[PDB]
Structure formats: structure tokens, C-alpha cells
Write a protein that binds this DNA or RNA. Structure first.
Ligand SMILES: [K+]
Ligand SMILES: [K+]
Ligand SMILES: [Mg+2]
Ligand SMILES: [Mg+2]
Ligand SMILES: [Mg+2]
Ligand SMILES: [Mg+2]
Ligand SMILES: [Mg+2]
Ligand SMILES: [Mg+2]
Ligand SMILES: [Mg+2]
Ligand SMILES: [Mg+2]
Ligand SMILES: [Mg+2]
Ligand SMILES: [Mg+2]
Lengths: 231, 112, 48, 54, 39
RNA sequence: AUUCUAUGAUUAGUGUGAACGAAAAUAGAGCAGCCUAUUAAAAUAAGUAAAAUGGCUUUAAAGCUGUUUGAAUAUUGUGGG
RNA sequence: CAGUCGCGUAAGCGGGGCAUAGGAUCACAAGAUACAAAAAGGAAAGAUCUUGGAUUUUUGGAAAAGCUACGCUAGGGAUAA
């Protein structure tokens, strides 16, 4: 004696259903999900919208599948023609908007600061063109260093800031969520981002290769001056 | 999010829409239907592009300048409550939860 | 005996942990998980 | 003149309260060193990682 | 007790022991108001 | 001060459970204080308080106890809770 | 829905596995919570949240071998002479 699984149809055709209601429990897709329907992990079909269950076949979608849908109007018939405009319901209620306004207080009912902030302290014409190329690169290299120095000042101030906030029991401590946002704003995990750029690496690889080859030129030329004196 | 569809439709050769009949079509039309509009002027869609737009911080101020009404209106998702009628609770503990079984409240109250 | 239950301790020193199973004849576990105390994804490492 | 709340006495405090300032700092010191620990973990790799708590 | 003394020591509750406090003083007998600044 | 009755209380609490189960306080019955005790007693208490261990009682305290050990001398803060 | 991460041009998808075969409480242990703290300041022992060790395999969860032709009592006669 096992516990019965009770598989099969839980809603017959034209039966009213609201979102989440199970329509068909199955082992595998005996009936595929169709219009306004969801399939769960175990292939159970649920209504996604309020409406009436409809069992149909869509030869345009799949030649040999049978689907279950949900129509907002009991008199509608599926499958809807592919060229007809989608039938959808708003599903929203109108309410007056909020009158929220920035009214952050400074002191609690006991006269104590809500937050106390502490900061820390610690080749004729080509040469002309190449010069324009070098200047542009040198200009950006100066700008990059003129702005990377700026980022190192905002990070230092942020990571060094300490906003102590009033908590229960008249205690003053830093909240854990603010401690998390010290390293950086949410949205990405600091450290996973690649600090370097692939294009910059290629540029460095060439420069190192040039000095190496050019290094042999100077050493080879230097050796020639020593040989001239010998001869 | 709202979908704003930018449609480009070609007019047939030698077919110039009257400058006054085009500004009359939108009169007293609050559900602009591209299908019907296209069929009346015998146009044909050739190009199209898309870009959406949702509520953002700058939405409220943009409505003020142009006087677009509807700023102080927020939409909340419609909630569907269960359609099952209320039923009396069942179980040994659920029955013996009234002052009658005050001597058995050590088995019925404060259950994890 | 073949499988052990390890504890992945947060490296934010917040005291939150995740428990996953792994075979003994394998390497220690190390994952990037969400620490609900600081509400940020940090590095979790096996206890021992 | 009772212990703690008497004249000329100081409340000792519960231990969670005494080790509060030293507890929030351990979390702050660790988060600041979080970006540098993930960079060393993604560079070295999950298999070659040898540093684990004790 | 500590809790009982602290409840009537703050002006938020209008405690009758609030006159024993200074404007910068806190009601709690253990915690203190940290100072804001860079030093 | 003690004793008797009820409430406090199918409570605090204990116990895997089943069950077991206080005290403060309140009300009533009685009321009485003393060592010069209204019938003849203390020069204010040392193998004692207490500790380890084995049991009892019990909520882990207090209380009772066999074995082995073993203190201090008054609010000018000694000793018990 | 809030929080914040991955993948994707985008739409979007993701709260393990194509579906159907792995038991609580108590006790105990490791983290967090800051609730209460038996005169008071602490603490112990409790409380909430997360998690772990179970042929708890009689798997809604006892630490458990037989004989009686000398048998006893209360019953049924599920047919047992
Ligand atoms: K009880
Ligand atoms: K004792
Ligand atoms: Mg009584
Ligand atoms: Mg004496
Ligand atoms: Mg004794
Ligand atoms: Mg004692
Ligand atoms: Mg004693
Ligand atoms: Mg106490
Ligand atoms: Mg006490
Ligand atoms: Mg059973
Ligand atoms: Mg069952
Ligand atoms: Mg029969």
C-alpha cells in the first residue's frame, strides 16, 4: 500500500481559475503549457491569470502537441490566430501617489544625535604626425594619471568614513549594511572586475620587445667601438 | 514599461495626404489604431524602430513642464484572494483551543 | 563516511555560514555567496 | 551604594556590549580587505587555494 | 536596576531623573555619545 | 515568633513524560512576650560553620547526614542569608 | 516584494538536478540574535534564527529472551480437540 499520487486533471474545460491554481498534474508533458499558463518543476501546469481553462491543439506552434490555456473571456476559443492582437488585461488598481518628502531629523526624542559621522586623516612630415600621435597618447596618459589620482582620493575618504548611528539601548555602532557598501556600491563584486585592459597589455608587450631588440643594437654597436680600437 | 513604436510608412506614388485631413483623424480618437489608420490612407509599413520608457526620477518633472496630467497616480498589482470558503480548523489541538479546555492548554498553546 | 558535511564560513567575519556536502577524497570547497549580514556577495571558505 | 548603580559605581555592561566596538571593527577591517582577497582567489584559482579559516 | 534607572533618566520619557543629565550627556549608564570630527 | 483555615496556585518551578508543586502577600481564628524566662536555664557557644566525597531533601541555593578534613570575632563592617 | 549576483545583443532566465525512491521533538554541539538576567552590577542556566551528528529502519520516533502437561483471572468462542 503506497500513498496515492492523484495525477490527472484538476480543472476541466471552461472552469474558472485564478493565478497559481493547478490545472493538470502529470509525469512528463502529456499536455504542454499554452496561453497564459506556467509549467512547474514536475511538469504541473498552473494558471498565470484569472480566467477559464481551455484544452486545445495548436497546429501552427507544433504539429503534434496538445496545450492547456487560460482565456479572459469564457466565450473565446483557442488557439488564437497568430495575426490577431494579443488579448491582455491591465491587472492594476489606481491609487493616489505618495507625498513623501525629505524630512530626515537630526536628534532623537532624548536629544541625542541620530547619526555621528567620523572621518579619517592620513621622416620629415611623418615626424610631425608621430609627434601628434605621441602627444595624444602622452596627453591621455597624463589625463589617466590625473584622474586615477582622483579616484584614489574618493575611495580613501569613503573607506575611511564612519557613520555611527543610534540603535537600541542608547548604543552607537556602525550598521553592517553600510560596512558592506564601503568598498563599493552594490551591483558588482569588487575584485572580479579586471583592473587591466587587454589593449594596454599589448602596448606594454611591444614596448618591452622594442627595448630588448633595441638593447641588442646598442650592445652590438658598443662592441663595434671596442673592436675598432683593437684593430 | 511602455513601448513606443516608431513606424515609417510609405505613401503610394502621387498620393499626398491633405494637411487638414490628417489633423482631423486624431480628433476625438483616444485609441490610435495603426491598422485602421493605415487602411484609410493606403499606406504601407517599410521601416520601424523601438524604444521603451518607464517611470524614472525625471518623469514627475517632465510632466510639470508640459502639464501632462496623471502624475499623482500610482498603480498597484491586483491581488486575487483564495476562492475557498472559510472552514473550521481541524486537529486535536485546534479543537481544544477555547477556554473550555483550559486544563489542556499546555498541549495546545505555544506550539512551535 | 564517504561524504562529509562541511561549513563554508564567510570571510567578512560576520559569522554567517553555508553547509554543503562533498566527498572526503576531494579538495576543500570555496564559493562566492551572499552574506545576509552585510548584504553583499563575499568569499566563503571551508571552516577547517 | 549597591554594586553598579550606587553612588560612585560604574555599570560593567553585558559582554555583548563590552565586545561591540571590537566586533564591528573586525567586520569593517575584513570588508576593506575583501576586494584584495577575491583578486588573490580568482588569480590563484579555487583548486590552488590553500588559505582557510581555523 | 540599570534599565529602570535609564528609563527615567532620559528626557524622551520625561523621566523625573532627567534633571541629573547634561545636554551632551546620554541617558545610558554605560554607552556614551561619540564625538564627530576628524582626529 | 509559632500553630490552624482559605486565597495566592491546574502559578513560579521541576520532570523526557505522566504528574508533582512553593514562597512573598492578603483575609479569618487566636495574639505574648522573654533570660529577674513566674520556676528557676547562657559566664553568648569549635571538631562547630564549612570543604571534598557517598546519600537524603530539592530547582543548582538553603536544610539533614556517614567517611576524611577544617574557620572567623561585631555596622570602626567579624560571621550567616 | 525587498536585498544583490551570474549569464545574455536583447527578450529575459536562475530560490539545484526531465519527473516519480533520504524522519520530528528532546538532549548535545558550532555560529549568529541582544530578548529576559530571581536584591543590584555581571554571569550561569534559558529564548529566537541557521546548521550538524540517527538501519531514531517497529522509519508519527520502548534500551527488552524463553518455559509452564501444575498454571491463575477476565473474556471471545475469528473453529481451536
Ligand atoms: K510550569
Ligand atoms: K547544600
Ligand atoms: Mg497555602
Ligand atoms: Mg551566637
Ligand atoms: Mg553542615
Ligand atoms: Mg551561598
Ligand atoms: Mg549555612
Ligand atoms: Mg543579578
Ligand atoms: Mg541572587
Ligand atoms: Mg509506526
Ligand atoms: Mg505517513
Ligand atoms: Mg464467525
Amino acid at each position: 500500500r503506497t500513498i496515492p499520487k492523484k495525477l490527472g486533471a484538476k480543472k476541466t474545460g471552461d472552469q474558472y481559475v485564478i493565478p497559481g491554481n493547478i490545472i493538470y498534474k502529470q509525469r512528463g508533458t502529456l499536455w504542454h503549457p499554452g496561453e497564459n499558463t506556467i509549467m512547474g518543476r514536475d511538469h504541473t501546469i498552473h494558471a498565470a491569470v484569472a480566467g477559464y481553462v481551455k484544452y486545445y491543439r495548436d497546429p501552427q506552434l507544433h504539429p503534434d502537441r496538445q496545450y492547456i490555456g487560460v482565456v479572459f473571456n469564457r466565450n473565446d476559443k483557442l488557439p488564437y490566430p497568430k495575426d490577431a492582437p494579443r488579448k491582455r488585461k491591465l491587472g492594476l488598481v489606481a491609487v493616489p501617489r505618495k507625498v513623501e518628502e525629505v524630512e530626515k531629523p537630526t536628534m532623537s526624542a532624548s536629544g541625542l544625535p541620530l547619526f555621528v559621522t567620523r572621518h579619517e586623516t592620513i621622416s620629415s612630415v611623418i615626424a610631425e604626425l608621430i609627434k601628434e600621435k605621441l602627444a595624444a597618447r602622452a596627453e591621455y596618459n597624463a589625463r589617466q594619471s590625473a584622474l586615477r589620482k582622483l579616484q584614489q582620493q574618493k575611495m580613501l575618504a569613503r573607506r575611511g568614513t564612519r557613520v555611527l548611528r543610534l540603535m537600541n539601548n542608547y548604543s552607537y555602532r556602525e550598521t553592517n549594511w553600510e560596512i558592506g557598501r564601503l568598498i563599493g556600491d552594490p551591483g558588482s563584486v569588487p575584485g572580479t572586475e579586471k583592473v587591466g585592459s587587454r589593449k594596454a597589455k599589448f602596448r606594454a608587450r611591444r614596448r618591452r620587445r622594442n627595448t630588448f631588440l633595441l638593447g641588442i643594437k646598442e650592445r652590438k654597436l658598443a662592441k663595434a667601438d671596442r673592436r675598432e680600437e683593437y684593430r | 514599461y511602455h513601448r513606443l513604436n516608431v513606424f515609417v510608412l510609405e505613401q503610394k506614388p502621387g498620393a499626398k495626404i491633405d494637411g487638414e485631413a490628417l489633423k482631423k483623424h486624431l480628433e476625438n480618437r483616444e485609441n490610435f489604431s495603426l491598422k485602421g489608420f493605415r487602411e484609410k490612407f493606403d499606406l504601407e509599413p517599410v521601416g520601424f524602430n523601438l524604444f521603451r520608457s518607464e517611470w524614472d526620477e525625471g518623469t514627475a518633472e517632465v510632466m510639470e513642464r508640459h502639464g501632462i496630467p496623471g502624475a499623482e497616480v500610482e498603480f498597484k498589482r491586483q491581488k486575487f484572494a483564495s476562492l475557498k470558503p472559510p472552514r473550521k480548523a481541524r486537529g486535536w489541538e485546534a479543537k481544544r483551543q477555547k477556554p473550555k479546555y483550559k486544563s489542556l492548554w499546555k498541549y495546545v498553546k505555544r506550539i512551535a | 563516511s564517504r561524504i562529509i558535511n562541511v561549513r563554508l564560513i564567510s570571510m567578512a567575519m560576520t559569522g554567517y555560514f553555508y553547509t554543503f556536502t562533498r566527498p572526503r577524497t576531494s579538495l576543500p570547497m570555496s564559493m562566492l555567496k551572499y552574506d545576509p549580514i552585510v548584504r553583499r556577495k563575499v568569499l566563503f571558505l571551508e571552516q577547517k | 551604594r549597591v554594586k553598579g548603580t550606587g553612588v560612585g559605581e560604574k555599570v560593567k555592561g553585558h559582554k555583548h556590549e563590552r565586545t561591540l566596538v571590537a566586533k564591528m571593527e573586525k567586520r569593517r577591517e575584513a570588508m576593506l580587505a575583501m576586494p584584495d582577497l577575491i583578486r588573490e582567489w580568482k588569480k590563484v584559482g579555487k583548486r590552488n587555494w590553500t588559505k582557510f579559516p581555523k | 536596576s540599570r534599565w529602570d534607572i535609564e528609563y527615567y533618566r532620559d528626557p524622551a520619557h520625561r523621566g523625573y531623573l532627567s534633571h541629573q543629565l547634561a545636554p551632551g550627556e546620554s541617558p545610558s549608564l554605560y554607552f556614551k555619545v561619540p564625538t564627530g570630527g576628524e582626529k
